[PDB]
Write an enzyme that holds these catalytic residues in place. Structure first.
Site, mmCIF file in Angstrom:
data_model
loop_
_atom_site.group_PDB
_atom_site.id
_atom_site.type_symbol
_atom_site.label_atom_id
_atom_site.label_comp_id
_atom_site.label_asym_id
_atom_site.label_seq_id
_atom_site.Cartn_x
_atom_site.Cartn_y
_atom_site.Cartn_z
ATOM 1 N N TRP B 130 0.844 -1.177 0.000
ATOM 2 C CA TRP B 130 0.000 0.000 0.000
ATOM 3 C C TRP B 130 0.896 1.250 0.000
ATOM 4 C CZ3 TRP B 130 -1.958 2.541 4.891
ATOM 5 C CH2 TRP B 130 -2.968 3.408 4.587
ATOM 6 N N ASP B 211 -1.364 -5.789 9.361
ATOM 7 C CA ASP B 211 -2.161 -4.766 8.742
ATOM 8 C C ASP B 211 -3.408 -5.443 8.184
ATOM 9 O OD1 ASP B 211 -2.756 -2.295 7.258
ATOM 10 O OD2 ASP B 211 -1.664 -3.135 5.642
ATOM 11 N N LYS B 246 -13.875 -0.886 4.898
ATOM 12 C CA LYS B 246 -14.190 -1.547 3.610
ATOM 13 C C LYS B 246 -15.181 -2.705 3.735
ATOM 14 C CE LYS B 246 -9.784 -0.001 2.335
ATOM 15 N NZ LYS B 246 -8.348 -0.192 2.596
HETATM 16 C C1 LIG Z 1 -7.588 0.551 3.286
HETATM 17 C C2 LIG Z 1 -6.281 0.076 3.833
HETATM 18 C C3 LIG Z 1 -5.728 0.611 5.018
HETATM 19 C C4 LIG Z 1 -6.476 1.699 5.833
HETATM 20 O O1 LIG Z 1 -7.253 2.512 5.549
HETATM 21 P P1 LIG Z 1 -8.307 3.264 6.469
HETATM 22 O O2 LIG Z 1 -9.075 4.031 5.435
HETATM 23 O O3 LIG Z 1 -7.492 4.053 7.404
HETATM 24 O O4 LIG Z 1 -9.105 2.183 7.105
HETATM 25 C C5 LIG Z 1 -4.577 0.133 5.518
HETATM 26 N N1 LIG Z 1 -3.986 -0.856 4.855
HETATM 27 C C6 LIG Z 1 -4.426 -1.363 3.665
HETATM 28 C C7 LIG Z 1 -3.658 -2.392 3.001
HETATM 29 C C8 LIG Z 1 -5.584 -0.896 3.134
HETATM 30 O O5 LIG Z 1 -6.074 -1.380 2.016
#
Ligand SMILES: *Cc1c(COP(=O)(O)O)cnc(C)c1O
Ligand SMILES: *Cc1c(COP(=O)(O)O)cnc(C)c1O
Lengths: 396, 396
Positions: B130, B211, B246
């Site tokens: 990410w 994560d 999500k």
């Molecule tokens: C979406 C995501 C996050 C965090 O996002 P938030 O919008 O803060 O919940 C962290 N790590 C990965 C891999 C993600 O896809």
């Protein structure tokens, strides 16, 4: 790695609570709490935010991500609240606004933008100031110093020992003010004094940093910000961190906004981009609900009519309790002039009690104040008042 | 101070959006967005969170401050979701949980606790990972390195070139994993491989940092976390940062939680206090609404019944679109084996297109993918599919 390496200690307000319900006597009176209470000793959810919340439940057709800087009209409303309707800062597009998780969230964001994209290394807070001021600014990487403000023999601002302590501040320094009026002391700079500090910060260097949490709580939504707005006219660079938690009752929702004025729309926009890069590394994008509530009230004359009324009702209760406290002292225990409680502004004030009068009140008399002698006057119900004064007169 | 000193540049996803509505052709297809879409191409607010929101509007009698660590039962629910019902971590009281503003908010909080109260100075993320992973960890003060994971000749994990790149990581290092499955690639470690990485991190040093954002999106709420839970049994120290955005549709509300397992209840509590000291310096206390929604759904078998159904409905749509994409390629443009899209998991995947096939799609053909060839498969409506493939077959 975490094993026996680590530490403690209690950020001093929050330590006072647990120690209190604990008392059963009733454990009659807890002052010092950071939040307002009414006639009955509870913190309700405003009727105006409650209406704006059904309006939301009715109309939200998505909970997808906010832009890093928040809601557009929330921004337009907070700059218009801070600077005025046609303040040339607004259009001249000299001001940009990022919705943040609270006043504390905006203070760190400022401090992190500053810490990486500027030359600031030191920042001056008053004496005393809000406890958390020190660890936010330190945390970003900066250092925090202390000008003098008040002292507790004559119960006011030392306007002479203040300007003559801010002369040790050099050109690249941040001076933090509190726009409305001051936590703990409750003590007002007059527009003539603001006028002054305004003009030193132009011919002296220093970036102003307004810490705006009690808007509408001292004199009225427009009157209070006249300090910040005296400053916003000499100045070409400014940062105000605002909170919507105490005057909107929106505390656990986390709503406030970090706004920067910065000389010309071309530069406030290069400077807002790095500011936005610091939010992305922090929380990413802001909490919609409570900010969405502040935006639809403020953009609705029916709902704003009712909210401004609740803001005038919160303010007058505090103003009524200062006179019901000062003269129920007068009328139940002669010892000294407590006058100053009256016209001092806001919820918080310094009683003028020793650490050992705080400790004399808290463990047999009921009354819980924070060790500094700082009492939340909003914490006084009309029924509190004559046992409240009991203890304070039994201690002088 | 802010004058002409400052800078730019665009965090690469977010740059793709504005450039798109801009197209009117319709500007037919934007893939790459970070969020899910349904049958129609919109991101709705879940019926289950919608019910829990009227329940709140009905029952909130106050909006006063949250404790720094959030809601109690929200904590109890997220640890119980991560570790199991009777996972000995829960009681043995080896795990503590802080509600945070999102997954990003929890990653910084970890990184700031680590940065000041520990010996960690470096942290390893996958290749790729990410985008924002790098600037969160860097921002706290740490350094970020890169193990190998995947590569794009054979469309999978190099389990051999992975373990033989994590041997350059020393005892005090943080290795970041993604529990469910991986952003962008979509590629699964099998429990046998997790089993492996679990046992290197015990006899090797390294603190695990999970994560966890796509729980319930690959195989099912319990199955997905079996990786993290394989790891949670060898280990005595762990940090998982979880998101509820999500898989709850709760994106702009900002809800997630930073949890640390740490060998014995006496130490997880010294280590959580400094962790709490880092939140106070950051946002102070968390955003109630969206977390309050996750706590009352999860603590209500009627509402949780319906939410788990919406979670199984989101997952199966993505699983249906992988087969509707792989074989509408099959059936409209012969060129190559795209198979791998199928059983790869989650919303995101790498198509296997050049930067110049991304640029060939985005400015005449409609299709907008992010420059890496990463497409959000949830962004495919059943009607998209045969013009979608048009462009991808016209480019090979
Ligand atoms: C979406 C995501 C996050 C965090 O996002 P938030 O919008 O803060 O919940 C962290 N790590 C990965 C891999 C993600 O896809
Ligand atoms: C309450 C307050 C803040 C901010 O608090 P939030 O809860 O983050 O809004 C900042 N400064 C002062 C002086 C305050 O009283």
């Amino acid at each position: 790695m975490f094993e026996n390496i680590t530490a403690a200690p209690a950020d001093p307000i929050l330590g006072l609570a647990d120690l209190f319900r604990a008392d059963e006597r009733p454990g009659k009176i807890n002052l010092g709490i950071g939040v307002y209470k009414d006639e009955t000793g509870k913190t309700p959810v405003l009727t105006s935010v409650k209406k704006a919340e059904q309006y939301l439940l009715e109309n939200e057709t998505t909970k997808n991500y906010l832009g890093i800087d928040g809601i557009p009209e929330f921004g337009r409303c907070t700059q218009e609240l801070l600077f005025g309707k046609g303040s040339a800062l607004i259009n001249d597009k000299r001001a940009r606004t990022a919705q943040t998780p609270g006043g504390t969230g905006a203070l760190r964001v400022a401090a992190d933008f500053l810490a990486k994209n500027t030359s600031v290394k030191r920042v001056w807070v008053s004496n005393p100031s809000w406890p958390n001021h020190k660890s936010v600014f330190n945390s970003a990487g900066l250092e925090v110093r202390e000008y003098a403000y008040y002292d507790a023999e004559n119960h006011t601002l030392d306007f002479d020992a203040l300007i003559n302590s801010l002369n040790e501040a050099q050109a690249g320094d941040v001076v933090l003010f509190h726009g409305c009026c001051h936590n703990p002391t409750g003590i007002d700079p007059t527009l003539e004094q603001w006028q002054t500090l305004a003009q030193l910060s132009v011919e002296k260097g220093w970036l102003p940093l307004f810490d705006f949490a009690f808007q509408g709580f001292a004199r009225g939504l427009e009157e209070d910000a006249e300090g910040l707005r005296a400053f916003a006219a000499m100045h070409k660079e400014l940062i105000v961190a605002s909170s919507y938690s105490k005057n909107f009752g929106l505390y656990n929702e986390r709503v406030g906004a970090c706004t920067l004025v910065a000389a010309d729309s071309e530069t406030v926009d290069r400077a807002f981009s790095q500011m936005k890069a610091a939010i992305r590394a922090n929380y990413s994008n802001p909490p919609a609900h409570g900010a969405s509530v502040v935006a639809t009230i403020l953009s609705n004359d029916a709902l704003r009519a009712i909210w401004e009324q609740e803001l005038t009702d919160m303010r007058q209760r505090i103003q009524r309790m200062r006179q019901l406290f000062v003269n129920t002292l007068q009328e139940k225990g002669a010892n000294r002039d407590f006058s100053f409680i009256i016209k001092q502004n806001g919820m918080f004030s310094f009683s003028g009690l020793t650490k050992e009068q705080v400790l004399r009140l808290r463990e047999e008399f009921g009354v819980y104040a924070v060790a500094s002698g700082r009492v939340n006057v909003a914490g006084m119900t009309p029924d509190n008042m004559a046992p409240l004064c009991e203890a304070i007169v039994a201690v002088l």
